[PDB]
Amino acid sequence: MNIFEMLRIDEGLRLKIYKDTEGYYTIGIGHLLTKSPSLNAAKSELDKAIGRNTNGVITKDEAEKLFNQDVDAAVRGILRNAKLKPVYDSLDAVRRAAAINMVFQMGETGVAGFTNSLRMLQQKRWDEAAVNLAKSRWYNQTPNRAKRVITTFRTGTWDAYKNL
Numbered sequence: 245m246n247i248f249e250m251l252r253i254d255e256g257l258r259l260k261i262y263k264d265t266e267g268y269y270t271i272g273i274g275h276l277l278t279k280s281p282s283l284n285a286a287k288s289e290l291d292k293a294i295g296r297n298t299n300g301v302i303t304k305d306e307a308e309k310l311f312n313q314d315v316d317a318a319v320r321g322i323l324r325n326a327k328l329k330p331v332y333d334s335l336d337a338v339r340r341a342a343a344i345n346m347v348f349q350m351g352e353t354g355v356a357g358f359t360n361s362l363r364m365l366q367q368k369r370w371d372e373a374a375v376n377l378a379k380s381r382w383y384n385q386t387p388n389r390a391k392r393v394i395t396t397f398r399t400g401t402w403d404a405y406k407n408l
């Protein structure tokens with residue numbers, strides 16, 4: 245297991261424009277297109293992302309290409325964020341994947357309220373961190389995925405992704 249296989253499980257793969265858990269137009273492996281309610285606006289973003297006139301449908305190769313870029317961009321974002329870099333640097337590689345997972349799903353604006361969780365993770369207070377992480381809109385709206393990500397932070401293992 246690694247961040248790519250992990251996010252592939254959590255995000256799935258769909259080759260036509262679909263709406264994510266929040267109702268936003270998305271494609272491929274959790275590639276958010278736009279928060280706009282306009283499908284035409286989504287299609288435009290898709291064409292710009294892929295570099296061709298797609299009309300809402302992409303190939304598996306194209307989806308994986310966007311996916312690699314999105315994972316790369318999430319990591320690069322963490323490393324450029326003063327509030328996230330120290331915690332991320334303090335973690336082992338399995339828990340780093342869990343961190344990248346959260347940023348991929350909610351962005352850096354989404355993780356701004358996790359200040360206390362982040363402190364507990366940097367302190368390696370894994371059970372306490374896990375309890376704090378669950379006290380969130382994130383956990384309530386996507387409990388099954390949050391539980392997997394939280395178990396990864398708690399244990400530093402891939403146990404929550406075995407069987408899947």
Ligand SMILES: Fc1c(F)c(F)c(F)c(F)c1F
Pocket residue numbers: 322328329331332333343344346347355358361362365
């Ligand atoms: F970068 C992050 C981390 F290193 C974390 F450990 C974490 F919980 C987050 F939500 C992050 F965005």
Ligand SMILES: [Cl-]
Pocket residue numbers: 260261299300301
């Ligand atoms: Cl479509």
